[PDB]
Write a protein that binds this ligand. Structure first.
Ligand SMILES: N#C/C=C/c1cc(Cl)cc(Oc2ccccc2OCCn2ccc(=O)[nH]c2=O)c1
Lengths: 405, 538
């Protein structure tokens, strides 16, 4: 109802970012949606005097045939002044990742009831493109708070506090966190009772996705158990172990390598010795312990690496410094993704990003095992998420792929 | 007098920290001065400019060529910042098409009243014995930075309600011009054109060419489109500018004419940095340009786009990292064509390049037609299957069918997932002295077969590749190779079918000859048995 003044960081101007091509149906959807939004005063047309531009496209969320408008605010988000509030830099609710169940809700309907600081509005400018440049693209700017901006939930923190005040006091055992346009709600309850409580909460929102963090995995490094070892087996073992020696200090491969001495066929069976078995055992025990001195630094960037294992399976690692992992994991999930690598990759990136948002309260920077052009061409078609993480592209195959399989 | 609807001005500012332009007026001849005085007088009578006094310290220079020329350059530097061509193949066929380019465009649209003081200029009087005459612009000046954007924005604003009231016609807006197509009867269409230009007359926009249209280097005919004739320069001396111009022109001609090859010519331009240097051509290049003039012999036209039909793109491999494509709806009638050159890289394969081409064509299509075309590709379904399933990278191509039009894209070798039973096991290694550039490369096997080859002018990576090559040469149809090289394995895991490194290519051919190859890796200097650092290091 009253606009809190917002500016950019010192020295930085408003985002000017090229609008990328859009399909005909997406353009139509955006046209209809924005035509509806203009009547409601949410956005207003602008003239040539506003050089700033931000990318925009359209998607379809889960279990819905209705197109949704998605703005890519990344450049604006980083150019937006770092938002510190009277919240005093709220510490992430670490009790969230420890919860039995967590439900993700979309609160983005609320941001449109709050007007935006006038001088800042020119920075929210976007363009609906036309096919084949036959007509100039339709340009709008946001009068209210746009979804996807990092300043919107920051400004709406107080209102959201006043709205969610009764629910939190009624049942204090329910954890609540807010990121962007999405609201995460944790509970230890039963799935049915969970869903009913969710209905209670959303109807509580009205008058003013199911995750399981406890079922989430932190993967250790495992070695094979065999009655019979071949030369190839032992060579692979020594490889993985020598790799793990970077992570774990006390790993020693010498007595295992001692078995390989001479030139033997890869398929030839090599029986282990007492020294060898002992060494392998000690290595196992070393691997069963966690990593020495692994910590999370909020002043550092999170990095997510993803490897494609094939057969619809993907592995991943979230970390800050090399060979120190904050998390590792695996995604085998198959829904309609069987014949498409890029769709799988996209859903994987979404899952990993969501988990990252739950644990550290911020998205990581992905290193994707895909060519820039392929990804950039196809990623928006499979993308159901309202937030967009940063990413880069690794074009050299890692040797570390089968070491996580 | 019927009142003309007012055009609301656009608020304009300058860049922060910078003030308006102040520049002296250059000396002009007497004829220039008189002509400028006359022109400015009649313009002032038209109401496009107005006289000003001493209160305006800002001065923009002027000239005469009669036509007045105002130089806004410095102002263009101090003015604020404001906000591709339509492709004929994307145009949907209409029975009637009218072209209207508003005459005296920028002057028809007013200027921000609080801005006008900055643009003001000065006409020097005779002998400089009198204070120069002072004028300021009341409208958008020709040559200003912010004129086109304001003009087109106003034009769009005015045009908006007419198109809504006339959904049965389609209007395209490029810069100063409007293009109105309709499927109605020519009498109807003409009348609606009259209605439109009346609608533009209400806001005071003056409007008036018939098919074919010469537009943006194209030629537009009612049922078909093409490009304006390309001028191919001939000479006994080919300079760098000749190569740039020919590359641009051939690229421009490639959208319609199939089979245009710019490769050699583009190779001639590497690190030139010379305004004048000549350069001879290879026989491949001469045959290339001769076949180019052969392709430019009998001209062909592109057709327009019909939304009710499928959009299809067919790709052919031209060889030497070159690809070509045709986008069409019905057989033998092309909407447009094009080419794809491979990105600069050390190693690569046909499948990758084909994928990249598909991505490119996809993007271009989404720009032009607003959708992704169906593909006809010279690759077997099984080939693509094996490729994308066994590739370490995520990859996808949209909906496509296999067309058999050789050469076909194929996979030339496949490495085993598991070690081969019965196959001999070659443990290979190589090393070199960084100082003397002398090294050794070789192998030892389980059957006692050994080789060590001494090498001059080499490096570790070269000797490791060489070692693998020696393993491939001396081994039977099925072989297991063990290497300590993360580099060699890095190269072979990327599956190149061609490389700019001859050693790698020889390795590739060797692999092609093989029935089964299993490549295994071990850490060096860990004393893994069979892995011999000692033979190569002497
Ligand atoms: N100078 C000049 C003109 C340039 C020009 C530029 C553009 Cl973006 C479009 C244009 O013509 C059209 C305008 C509105 C709708 C469809 C159109 O074209 C559809 C295809 N078509 C082209 C020519 C013709 O005679 N008949 C025909 O059907 C003309």
């Amino acid at each position: 109802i009253e606009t809190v003044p917002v500016k950019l960081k010192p020295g930085m101007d408003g985002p000017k970012v090229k609008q990328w091509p859009l399909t005909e149906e997406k353009i139509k959807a955006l046209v209809e949606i924005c035509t509806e939004m203009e009547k409601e005063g949410k956005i207003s047309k602008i003239g040539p005097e506003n050089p700033y531009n931000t990318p925009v496209f359209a998607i379809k969320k889960k279990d819905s045939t209705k197109w949704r408008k998605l703005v890519d605010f990344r450049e604006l988000n980083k150019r937006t002044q770092d938002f510190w509030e009277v919240q005093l830099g709220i510490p992430h609710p670490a009790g969230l990742k420890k919860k039995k169940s967590v439900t993700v809700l979309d609160v983005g309907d609320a941001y449109f009831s709050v007007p935006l600081d006038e001088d800042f509005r020119k920075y929210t400018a976007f363009t609906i493109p036309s096919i084949n440049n036959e007509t100039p693209g339709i340009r709008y700017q946001y009068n209210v708070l746009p979804q996807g901006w990092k300043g919107s939930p920051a400004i709406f923190q107080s209102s959201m506090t006043k709205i969610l005040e009764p629910f939190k006091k009624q049942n204090p055992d329910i954890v609540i966190y807010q990121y962007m346009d999405d609201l995460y709600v944790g509970s230890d309850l039963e799935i049915g009772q969970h869903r009913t409580k969710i209905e209670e909460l959303r109807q509580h929102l009205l008058r003013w996705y199911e995750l399981h963090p406890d079922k989430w995995t932190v993967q250790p490094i495992v070695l094979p158990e065999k009655d019979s070892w071949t030369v190839n087996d032992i060579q692979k073992l020594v490889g993985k172990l020598n790799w793990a020696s970077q992570i774990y200090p006390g790993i020693k491969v010498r007595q295992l390598s001692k078995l390989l001495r001479g030139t033997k066929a890869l398929t030839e069976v090599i029986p282990l010795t007492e020294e060898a078995e002992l060494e392998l055992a000690e290595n196992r025990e070393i691997l069963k312990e966690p990593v020495h001195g692994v910590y999370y630094d909020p002043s550092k960037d999170l990095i997510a690496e993803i490897q494609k294992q094939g057969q619809g399976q993907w592995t991943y690692q979230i970390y800050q410094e090399p060979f120190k992992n904050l998390k590792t994991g695996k995604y085998a999930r198959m829904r309609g993704a069987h014949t498409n690598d890029v769709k799988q990759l996209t859903e994987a990136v979404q899952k990993i990003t969501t988990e990252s948002i739950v644990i550290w309260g911020k998205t990581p920077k992905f290193k994707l095992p895909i060519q820039k052009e392929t990804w950039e061409t196809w990623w928006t078609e499979y993308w159901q998420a309202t937030w967009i993480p940063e990413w880069e592209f690794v074009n050299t195959p890692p040797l570390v792929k089968l070491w996580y399989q | 007098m019927v009142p003309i609807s007012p055009i609301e001005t656009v608020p304009v500012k300058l860049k922060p920290g910078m003030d308006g332009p102040k520049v002296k007026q250059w000396p002009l001849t007497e004829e220039k001065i008189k002509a400028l005085v006359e022109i400015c007088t009649e313009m002032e009578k038209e109401g496009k400019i107005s006289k000003i006094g001493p209160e305006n310290p800002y001065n923009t220079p002027v000239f005469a060529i009669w036509r007045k020329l105002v130089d806004f350059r410095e102002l263009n530097k101090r003015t604020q910042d404001f906000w591709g061509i339509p492709h004929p193949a994307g145009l949907k066929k209409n029975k009637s098409v009218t072209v209207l380019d508003v005459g005296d465009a920028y002057f028809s649209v007013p200027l921000d009243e609080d801005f006008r003081k900055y643009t003001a200029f000065t006409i020097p009087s005779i002998n400089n014995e009198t204070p120069g005459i002072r004028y300021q612009y009341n409208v958008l000046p020709q040559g200003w930075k912010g004129s086109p954007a304001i003009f087109q924005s106003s034009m769009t604003k005015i045009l908006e309600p007419f198109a809504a009231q006339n959904p049965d016609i389609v209007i395209c807006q490029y810069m100063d011009d409007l293009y109105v197509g309709s499927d109605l009867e020519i009498g109807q269409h003409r009348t609606k054109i009259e209605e439109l230009r009346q609608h533009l007359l209400r806001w005071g926009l003056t409007t008036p060419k018939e098919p074919p249209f010469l537009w943006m280097g194209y030629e537009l005919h009612p049922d078909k489109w093409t490009v304006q004739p390309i001028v191919l320069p001939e000479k006994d001396s080919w300079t760098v500018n000749d190569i740039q111009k020919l590359v641009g022109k051939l690229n421009w001609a490639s959208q319609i004419y199939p089979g245009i090859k710019v490769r050699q010519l583009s190779k001639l331009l590497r690190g030139t940095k010379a305004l004048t240097e000549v350069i001879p051509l290879t026989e491949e290049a001469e045959l290339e340009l001769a076949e180019n003039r052969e392709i430019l012999k009998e001209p062909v036209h592109g057709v327009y786009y019909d939304p009710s039909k499928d959009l299809i793109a067919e790709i052919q491999k031209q060889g030497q990292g070159q690809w070509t494509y045709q986008i069409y709806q019905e057989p033998f009638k092309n909407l447009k064509t094009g080419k794809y050159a491979r990105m600069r890289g050390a190693h690569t394969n046909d499948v990758k390049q084909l994928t990249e081409a598909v991505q490119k064509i996809t993007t271009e299509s989404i720009v032009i037609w607003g959708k992704t075309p169906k593909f006809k590709l010279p690759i077997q379904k099984e080939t693509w299957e094996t490729w994308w399933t066994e590739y370490w990278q995520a990859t996808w191509i949209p909906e496509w069918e296999f067309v058999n039009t050789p050469p076909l894209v194929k996979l030339w070798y496949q490495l085993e997932k598991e070690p081969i039973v019965g196959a001999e096991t070659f443990y290979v290694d190589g090393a070199a002295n960084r100082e003397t550039k002398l090294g050794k490369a070789g192998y030892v096997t389980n059957k006692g077969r050994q080789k060590v080859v001494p090498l001059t002018n080499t490096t570790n990576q070269k000797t490791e590749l060489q070692a693998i090559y020696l393993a491939l040469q001396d081994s039977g149809l099925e072989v297991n190779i063990v290497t300590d090289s993360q580099y060699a394995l890095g190269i072979i895991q990327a599956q190149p079918d061609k490389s700019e490194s001859e050693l790698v290519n020889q390795i590739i051919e060797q692999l092609i000859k093989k029935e089964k190859v299993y490549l295994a890796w071990v850490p060096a200097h860990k004393g893994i048995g069979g892995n011999e650092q000692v033979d190569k290091l002497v």
